[PDB]
Design a protein around this nucleic acid. Sequence first.
DNA 1: GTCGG
DNA 2: GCTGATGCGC
DNA 3: CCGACGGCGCATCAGC
Length: 324
Amino acid sequence: APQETLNGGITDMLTELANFEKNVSQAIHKYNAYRKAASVIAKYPHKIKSGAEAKKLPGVGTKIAEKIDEFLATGKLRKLEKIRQDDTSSSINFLTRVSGIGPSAARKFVDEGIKTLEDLRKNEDKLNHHQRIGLKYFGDFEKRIPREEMLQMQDIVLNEVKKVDSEYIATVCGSFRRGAESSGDMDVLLTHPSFTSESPKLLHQVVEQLQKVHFITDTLSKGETKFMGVCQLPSKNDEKEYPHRRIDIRLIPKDQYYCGVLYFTGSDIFNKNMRAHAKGFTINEYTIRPLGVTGVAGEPLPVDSEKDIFDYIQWKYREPKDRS
DNA sequence: GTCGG
DNA sequence: GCTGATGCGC
DNA sequence: CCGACGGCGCATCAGC
Ligand SMILES: Nc1nc(=O)n([C@@H]2CS[C@H](COP(=O)(O)OP(=O)(O)OP(=O)(O)O)O2)cc1F
Ligand SMILES: [Ca+2]
Ligand code: NA
Ligand code: NA
Ligand code: NA
Ligand code: NA
Ligand code: NA
């Protein structure tokens, strides 16, 4: 992609606006509007000279064009400069960095004068379990995970899953599967021949084994098909500890596995494109369905490889590396 | 906020 | 007790 | 003008 020195001032401005819309205004559609605009501008291979120029791009409209004109004329946006100074809004925005504190919790905290991590720390009884864990690992959860460490993590997960039952299949998806040099977390998809579209404790026994070997250290949420938690690589006799990392584990039916793998591999942006580009078809995380004459989705087609799904749409098979 | 019925 | 709604992360 | 904009699983809240 183009160098960030091209339009980084504009992209950074739009992303900061997007965050205030999500976290303070609770205006999720304006957050996505600003993100879309920032993304289309990030990809534009020219230094923008005017709001009119940017307005030609899809997702940039009248108001972002006007903001780009103020930014180019002054190096700032009055509106952003003001909200950055605002103790209430800045504090709400900041607290949403804690995993489990969304815009609603953040506002409620700030309204009670709880505005900093220090205030959260003093008020543990006002936090739910997930929020306590997000606070405990605030710094670690914002660190990226080098690929080297992801491989070590993958080694542990695959070894322990097979130890519980050698018929499991486990696949690390997300940016790792796309060969990224670092990841934000570990996404694991799990299946087992006994669990299909029509069919005990298959997710639990895996989570329990990873806990028994002290890889999984905390649990954010855990149901029959989705686990969200925290893990940590072991360190040698005295290296400093590794950071705690986020890990998800999803149990998916065997006959929907490849649609699962495709979906959770991503990127989010690739999937949107692959879905939008689907001829008389609709693809979700579970299935690929042929749309009828009226646009109604019919029955799921059988799938025994990611490629089958590319075939159905006559889409040129991209490998995970090329789904960016 | 942007798009498009 | 329970159902359904909302918040949340992704 | 005005509605769509992603949808899922789990934790927790609101209310019967
Ligand atoms: N909000 C999201 N909704 C999605 O459907 N997705 C889908 C399902 S998961 C897949 C991309 O996965 P992630 O969200 O794990 O992001 P990633 O692994 O590509 O990136 P990162 O290394 O986790 O930062 O695309 C992603 C989202 F972030
Ligand atoms: Ca991920
Ligand atoms: Na609002
Ligand atoms: Na435009
Ligand atoms: Na948060
Ligand atoms: Na109810
Ligand atoms: Na993820």
